[PDB]
Design a protein around this ligand. Structure first.
Ligand SMILES: N[C@@H](Cc1ccc(O)cc1)P(=O)(O)C[C@H](CC(=O)O)C(=O)O
Ligand SMILES: [Zn+2]
Ligand SMILES: [Zn+2]
Length: 393
């Protein structure tokens, strides 16, 4: 059979655990959670990267659904609860296809019955409003990882896409990591500064993840992971879930985006300005310089290097579907994963290597978080500390 046919066979046995899909935010923005208007039991290819049929075609067996909210707007906690509610509603609406999962055992139970294990990950520490009790409430509601920042610093952690702030984690930031370890919530180091990555690895007594980050050695961008950090994953026991975002994984797209951003500033606009006037400027840039397009090969280049440095036991996949506008050719929506698996087969990845990448590493890591949590919950009570106490007024 072809490598694509073999890939589909392999995914039927050990499907993809995807680290980060922003369907909930997409539903919030497109239809304010009017789920009938974007029914994922129907074909949503006109509007979304994600629906149930395409997930099945793609060999997705578990999904961390992102409960991302904007850090630059007030009411992040309320919005996070709305995002969690959206995930709960999706699970309730589609019991034939989805099964809530809170544990590694739930993931295996879902796989045994042919349902997609549906987990939640918060995207940015702003979702806890500097409150450890709020962190504990998010865990109680089912959140199983939290990205420590999004694109901006928060009071206790530095983002890769902001200026230096506290220098990594503050004292309260370390306290957040400790409490995540005690609860069993995975520490997610996507988005954070390299300083923050190192501080989190120093502090964490559980395996950490990167829910959607690729390799900085392959493509120098702050959203990607440095080799020295990848090297620490074996010891930590965690995993880096490669992402598909072209402006992170393809050198030409990194360079193009930098030039587009410079061009915006040359016209007196902030690079994130989305006014009609700013859009005119950007359209003119794209007219003279077309947007480069990544491929499955681009993503495989990241995985090859990540495998060399981190090891095959420390890799996963986090596509970022419905969280980013552009995709590599062959990975245009959630049905695309078999194309990546086929490319890896062609590059000599073994069947067991691939079962680790798709399924086994993610289950091991969540189980490890549970194991560390058992020990810490038995050893001490929850923290009552405040940011004022640990970081000063
Ligand atoms: N949650 C998404 C951001 C978002 C998307 C849409 C929206 O209205 C607001 C925020 P993201 O962080 O998952 C995607 C980002 C790359 C990109 O911007 O393309 C990255 O991961 O680094
Ligand atoms: Zn992100
Ligand atoms: Zn996201």
């Amino acid at each position: 059979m072809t490598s694509l046919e073999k890939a589909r066979e392999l995914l039927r046995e050990f499907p993809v655990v995807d680290g980060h899909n922003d369907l909930p935010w997409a539903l919030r923005e497109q239809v304010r959670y009017d789920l009938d208007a974007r029914d994922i039991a129907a074909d949503q290819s006109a509007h979304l990267h994600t629906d149930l049929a395409r997930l099945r075609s793609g060999g997705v067996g578990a999904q961390y659904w992102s409960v991302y909210v904007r850090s630059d707007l007030p009411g992040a906690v309320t919005a996070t609860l709305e995002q969690i509610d959206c995930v709960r509603r999706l699970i309730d609406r589609h019991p034939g296809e989805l099964r809530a999962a809170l544990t590694a055992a739930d993931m295996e139970a879902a796989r045994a019955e042919g349902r997609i294990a549906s987990l939640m990950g918060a995207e940015g520490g702003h979702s806890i409003d500097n409150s450890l009790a709020t962190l504990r409430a998010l865990y109680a509601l089912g959140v199983r990882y939290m990205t420590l920042t999004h694109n901006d610093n928060n009071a206790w952690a530095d983002s890769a896409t902001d200026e230096p702030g506290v220098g990594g984690l503050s004292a309260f930031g370390r306290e957040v990591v400790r409490e995540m370890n005690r609860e069993g919530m995975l520490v997610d180091l996507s988005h954070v500064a390299a300083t923050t990555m190192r501080d989190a690895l120093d502090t964490s007594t559980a395996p950490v993840i990167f829910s959607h980050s690729s390799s900085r050695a392959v493509c120098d961008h702050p959203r990607n992971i440095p080799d020295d950090v990848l090297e620490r994953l074996s010891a930590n026991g965690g995993m880096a879930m490669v992402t598909f975002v072209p402006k992170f994984v393809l050198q030409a797209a990194v360079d193009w985006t930098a030039e587009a951003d410079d061009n915006m500033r040359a016209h007196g606009f902030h690079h994130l300005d989305s006014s009609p006037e700013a859009m005119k400027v950007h359209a003119a840039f794209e007219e003279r310089v077309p947007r480069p397009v990544a491929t499955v090969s681009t993503v495989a280049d990241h995985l090859d290097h990540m495998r060399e440095v981190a090891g095959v036991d420390h890799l996963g996949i986090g596509g970022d579907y419905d969280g980013t506008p552009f995709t590599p050719d062959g990975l245009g929506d959630v049905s695309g994963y078999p194309n990546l698996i086929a490319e890896l087969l062609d590059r000599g990845w073994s069947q067991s290597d691939l079962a680790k990448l798709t399924w086994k590493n993610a289950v091991r890591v969540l189980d490890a978080a549970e194991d560390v949590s058992r020990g810490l919950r038995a050893a001490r009570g929850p923290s009552n500390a405040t940011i004022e106490q640990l970081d000063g007024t």
